[PDB]
Design a protein around this nucleic acid. Structure first.
Ligand SMILES: [Ca+2]
Ligand SMILES: [Ca+2]
Ligand SMILES: [Zn+2]
Ligand SMILES: [Zn+2]
Ligand SMILES: [Zn+2]
Ligand SMILES: [Zn+2]
Lengths: 84, 270, 84, 276
DNA sequence: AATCGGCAATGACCTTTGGTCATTCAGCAGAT
């Protein structure tokens, strides 16, 4: 594989895990996708924990993603992110 | 997050009216108040602008529409520190004045195109002719153009102007918000304009079309899949019900105001 | 057939006329060619009259040369000239 | 003509030391005396240069090597009025208006050196200020048309490594004194022999006989044989640079004609130069 | 008579206290 191709494939897994999660029933408890849609600043270690607790394995990716790799993902999607 | 999208939040380019070569980059939700802080009429001004021989300062340009204080504070850092800002998506982690007005413009032009900030619901304002001239001079030499979505507006004196014509509150959307409160208080939301599903009161995030006289509501996640008909953050879009064009930023301002700023709304509607 | 080419062919007749004339036997009385080589400022109507007094006919050009054409030729040759 | 090729005749670029924007274009055979005229130490100066607010003036650059006073006056008029000067070979017949800027002088001077009417003249460009020389180099770098390598562009900035600048430019024929002395001995005693090109004997007094410029070399030739040898280019009349068939030394056509016209038409400036 | 482009002068900076860099910010002379 290519180092920028291992990324483009990883990033589609994070995307699919994020956009296919159920939408909120309580509007005060938005999903990670809806938090991005409303420009909620994303706390990196929280989304990283979420992706690494079944959501990646759900969308067919066996492997733990790194917090800074989730940060790369947010920057590439214009998604506001920050460390904790 | 507990707060709604702010009424106004800006990253501004401050310049001395005495030495034009002296510049300074900052952020504020209240451009007029902060300018008074720089000019010594109100306590709290920065250390660079404290110098007596440089007062008074002026705000020659600013970018607005930042959907959070964090978003503005990050754009402000990347604009103040161009030599440290890495614009390739990265796993990463007084004020020295900018070199020139031409470098601020080139780095501002760069920042509005890099993936970190490319899709933010921003807008550039120019308040002096010669600063806007250097901007147009750089834009014309550049090959990669800016988003048509990214409005770049001017407000020159002559013919309340400048930062003193910028609304510091939610009055510009007050009509849209009033439409929103009455549609949802009387449960007139109907079905999602996209998926055609009934939207019971309190069932997830239901976003409202920004065009006046139209009552089209949809699930937040449906509205975004429609504008984007890969990519996550929508920018511009068209309402399927009324056919009107919409900015994704304005639709989120009202949604977060209705969902997280109920006290801000009642004060707006007075 | 051409106005840029006939002016080139005319200038070849002037060149050959100047260049092939016999050289001065008295160094105080140089030929027109030797005046140019020594950067004598060339009085146009003088060289003009000389070319039309048998020189162009000698090198095979029937027709009269105009002083402006002789002026064009000099300037094309870096030969310094003047009007009397 | 009647007179020999002048020792020095120049076209200069005058600039004020009080305002660098004020420029002026002139010609003179005596750059030092003409500067003193501009600055009011000697009578005979210009009217544009009469403002004592603008004085002192200075000559920041000049073009030398003009073989006629007419040749300088022509080049000076073209450099003064670039908007009137037709550079296409044309059948046609003092800046009271100062030039726009130094960049425009640099740009137009660069053009005048490349056009047919002045291209093959035995000229030489002098630069006496670093900033005027930098504007010139900035233009030459951008331009794709090079000046001919045959044409020299020299500098003389103050100090380094005395009379410098225009005061270092010789006003008489002393730079070629040996060459002129070599010619007199050669021809006064009939040592010219035969033409190095056509191999024909050259009796004393038989036409114009030009002499190789290199020290200690004998080469004499028929004037029109030298040129045919030098030009052995495309279409040309005026030689520029050549090589002596006897000593193999490189020559400039302008230097050789300066001695020819001295020996031929300037016999009394010869005797003053040799003090004979 | 008001403009005008290009210069000469000036200020700020971060100390290498002066060589950078920028500006024309209530300028400036000169030319049209
Ligand atoms: Ca206006
Ligand atoms: Ca015939
Ligand atoms: Zn829906
Ligand atoms: Zn609508
Ligand atoms: Zn011969
Ligand atoms: Zn020789």
């Amino acid at each position: 594989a290519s180092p920028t191709d291992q990324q483009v494939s990883l990033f589609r897994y994070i995307t699919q895990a994020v956009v296919t999660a159920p939408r909120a029933k309580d509007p005060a408890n938005p999903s990670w996708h809806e938090k991005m849609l409303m420009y909620d600043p994303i706390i990196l270690e929280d989304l990283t924990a979420w992706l690494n607790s079944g959501q990646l394995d759900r969308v067919g990716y066996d492997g733990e993603v790194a917090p800074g790799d989730v940060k790369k993902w947010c920057e590439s999607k214009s998604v506001c992110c920050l460390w904790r | 997050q507990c707060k709604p999208i702010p009424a106004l939040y800006t990253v501004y380019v401050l310049r001395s009216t005495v030495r034009h070569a002296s510049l300074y980059i900052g952020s504020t939700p209240n451009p007029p108040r902060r300018l008074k802080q720089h000019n010594g009429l109100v306590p709290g001004g920065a250390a660079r602008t404290s110098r007596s021989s440089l007062r008074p300062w002026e705000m020659v340009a600013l970018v607005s529409g930042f959907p959070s204080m964090v978003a503005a504070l990050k754009f402000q850092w990347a604009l103040t520190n161009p030599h440290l800002s890495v614009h390739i998506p990265s796993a990463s982690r007084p004020q020295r004045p900018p070199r020139s007005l031409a470098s601020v413009v080139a780095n501002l032009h760069l920042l509005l195109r890099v993936p970190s900030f490319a899709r933010w619901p921003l807008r550039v304002h120019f308040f002096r002719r010669d600063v806007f001239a250097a901007w147009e001079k750089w834009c014309a030499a550049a090959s990669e153009r800016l988003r048509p979505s990214l409005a770049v507006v001017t407000d020159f004196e002559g013919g309340c102007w400048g930062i003193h014509a910028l609304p510091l509150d939610y009055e510009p959307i007050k009509d849209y918000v009033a439409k929103g409160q009455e549609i949802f208080e009387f449960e007139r939301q109907g079905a999602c304009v996209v998926c055609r599903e009934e939207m019971a009161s309190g069932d997830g995030l239901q976003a409202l079309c920004t065009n006046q006289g139209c009552d089209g509501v949809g699930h937040l996640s449906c509205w975004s899949r429609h504008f984007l008909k890969d990519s996550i953050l929508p920018v511009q879009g068209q309402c399927p019900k009324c056919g009107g064009e919409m900015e994704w930023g304005n639709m989120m301002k009202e949604l977060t105001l209705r969902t997280r700023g109920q006290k801000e709304v009642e004060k707006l509607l007075k």
